[PDB]
Structures are given as structure tokens and as C-alpha cells.
């Protein structure tokens, strides 16, 4: 009856909702529109940081990147304050994850190198983790703005969940680089009203949000039960029926997470 409750959420919030929680040794996968495409929005920033960590030695985190005011695009709570000084790769990773900083993301994409300002290389990184579905095609902010139906800049709840599973719980990264990525997601400042809000306080939650036009609101998380049992949770939503100006509904994400927690308890 989990499906009926996710469907009732779609009607309550006038939204399309996508959910995936991978199977574990004791629980079945939870899936709802898990194979439908949704815009990444900022959720891509979490595997982006993984890609940067993966392709360089740790000493690369201290390499300083300089940029100008013309480089500052989209939401940039952090980068604007370090134009004069530049920011290291490590600081950029911190900003991209914990504050969803779009200029930081663009600079990290450029750091991956190659055509499309790093987007082809980013998609290549996802392929190395077995994700054949997702693709990133534009940088911030254009990537939040593709029309419904465009496959560009999309993933599926299923695909992004399996990526996050390998990065945080699996062996995609060595322990030291894995801990840095985990720690930035643990100290995220943007997801209090989403997956975190849907889980009781005694469950640990690390996450990365995404927000966009056409009422787009996403959150991808790893959670741990009060006795330390981990699950990966991907929730994505949009409201295409309202057109470009449709409002994202964070509450819908929090309610879907509560339905999930009830099944995981």
C-alpha cells in the first residue's frame, strides 16, 4: 500500500514524485517512478565532488583556483566572498556540497576538463560507477531550466541512489576521500526541510538538495537508523503542470521521507 500513499502525496501536493531506496540484506527496494527521468538540479554536486576527489591526489585539494566576478553565476552564497582571494579545490568542494554553490560547481566542472565545460567528463565519471542513464549537459544555472521532456541534465531516482550508495557506503572512493565527501554531506546546510525533516531526529541524515524551475525539488541522502543500520534515500519531484513558474514543494519531500521511515522502522 506504499504505492497508494505515494500516489496520494502526488495528488495532495499536485506533483510528480519519484522515490528509490535500494534493497539491503533485510529489506526490499522501495520504488515509485524510480526509473522516470527527473532533472538533477543541484544533486549532481555530490557526485561531482566525488569525481574531483577520484581523479586527483589529496594534495590537489590545496590547489588554489582564481576567478572573477564575471565567473559568478546562479546562487553563490560562498564564492562571491572570495573573488579577491580565490578558493582552493577543497573549499570549492565544501561550498558546492554544503551551500549548493553554483559557481563552485562550475569551477569544479572546469577542473574535470574536456568539452562542455566538464559536463562530458562528469557523465563519464557516472558511467564508471555503472550509471548509464544520467547525463549532465549544461552548467549552473542553465542545468536547472530545461523543459519537461528534455532528457538533458536528468537522472532517475534509481540511478542516483545507486551512485550515492557506492560513494558513501561502497568502495568507489578510498576511505580518506570517502570520509571527506561524507563529512561535507553530513554538514549540509540546505536540506533541513526535506529528507531530514521526514526522519526522526535519532536517525542520522547526510544529504544533498536540488531546486529548480517547473516546481523542481530533490533531495538525495544516506540515513542511519538509531542502531546504525544504513539506507540510501532518493526523492525527486517536479510540477510541470504549472509551467516554468511552478513552486517547488519541500513539504512533499519531507512527507515522502516520513512514509519511507515508517517502512524502514
UniProtKB/Swiss-Prot annotation:
Recorded GO CC terms: extracellular region; periplasmic space
Notes on activation and inhibition: Is inhibited by clavulanate.
Short name of one Pfam family: Beta-lactamase2
Location(s) in or outside the cell: Periplasm; Secreted
Residues under site feature: Increases nucleophilicity of active site Ser: 45
E.C. number(s) listed in UniProt: 3.5.2.6
Binding site for substrate: 100, 209-211
Coiled coil: none
Active site per UniProt: 42 (acyl-ester intermediate), 140 (proton acceptor)
The keyword Lipoprotein is assigned to this record: no
PTM summary: Exported by the Tat system. The position of the signal peptide cleavage has not been experimentally proven.
Record keywords: Antibiotic resistance, Hydrolase, Periplasm, Secreted, Signal
PROSITE patterns in the cross-refs: BETA_LACTAMASE_A
Record's subunit section: Monomer.
NCBIfam families: bla_class_A, MTB_classA_BlaC
Record-stated family: Belongs to the class-A beta-lactamase family.
Function: Extended spectrum beta-lactamase (ESBL) that inactivates beta-lactam antibiotics by hydrolyzing the amide group of the beta-lactam ring. Displays high levels of penicillinase and cephalosporinase activity as well as measurable activity with carbapenems, including imipenem and meropenem. Plays a primary role in the intrinsic resistance of M.tuberculosis to beta-lactam antibiotics.
Protein name: Beta-lactamase
Naturally occurring in which organism (per UniProt): Mycobacterium tuberculosis (strain CDC 1551 / Oshkosh)
Phylogenetic lineage: Bacteria, Bacillati, Actinomycetota, Actinomycetes, Mycobacteriales
Gene this protein is translated from: blaC
Amino acid at each position: 500500500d506504499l504505492a497508494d500513499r505515494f500516489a496520494e502525496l502526488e495528488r495532495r501536493y499536485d506533483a510528480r514524485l519519484g522515490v528509490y531506496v535500494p534493497a539491503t540484506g533485510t529489506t526490499a527496494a522501495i520504488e515509485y517512478r524510480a526509473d522516470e527521468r527527473f532533472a538533477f538540479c543541484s544533486t549532481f554536486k555530490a557526485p561531482l565532488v566525488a569525481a574531483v576527489l577520484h581523479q586527483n591526489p589529496l594534495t590537489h585539494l590545496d590547489k588554489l583556483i582564481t576567478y572573477t566576478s564575471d565567473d559568478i553565476r546562479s546562487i553563490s552564497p560562498v564564492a562571491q566572498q572570495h573573488v579577491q582571494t580565490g578558493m582552493t579545490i577543497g573549499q570549492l568542494c565544501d561550498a558546492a556540497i554544503r551551500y549548493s554553490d553554483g559557481t563552485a560547481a562550475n569551477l569544479l566542472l572546469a577542473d574535470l576538463g574536456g568539452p562542455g565545460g566538464g559536463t562530458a567528463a562528469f557523465t563519464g565519471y557516472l558511467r564508471s560507477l555503472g550509471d548509464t542513464v544520467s547525463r549532465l549537459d549544461a552548467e549552473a544555472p542553465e542545468l536547472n531550466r530545461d523543459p519537461p521532456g528534455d532528457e538533458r541534465d536528468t537522472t532517475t531516482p534509481h540511478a542516483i541512489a545507486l551512485v550515492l550508495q557506492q560513494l558513501v557506503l561502497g568502495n568507489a572512493l578510498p576511505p580518506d576521500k570517502r570520509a571527506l565527501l561524507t563529512d561535507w554531506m553530513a554538514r549540509n546546510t540546505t536540506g533541513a526541510k526535506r529528507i531530514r525533516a521526514g526522519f526522526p531526529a535519532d536517525w542520522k541524515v547526510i544529504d544533498k538538495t536540488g531546486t529548480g524551475d517547473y516546481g523542481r525539488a530533490n533531495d538525495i541522502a544516506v540515513v542511519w537508523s538509531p542502531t546504525g543500520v544504513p539506507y540510501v534515500v532518493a526523492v525527486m519531484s517536479d510540477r510541470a503542470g504549472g509551467g516554468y513558474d511552478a513552486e517547488p514543494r519541500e513539504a512533499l519531500l519531507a512527507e515522502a521521507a516520513t512514509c519511507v521511515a515508517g517502512v524502514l522502522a
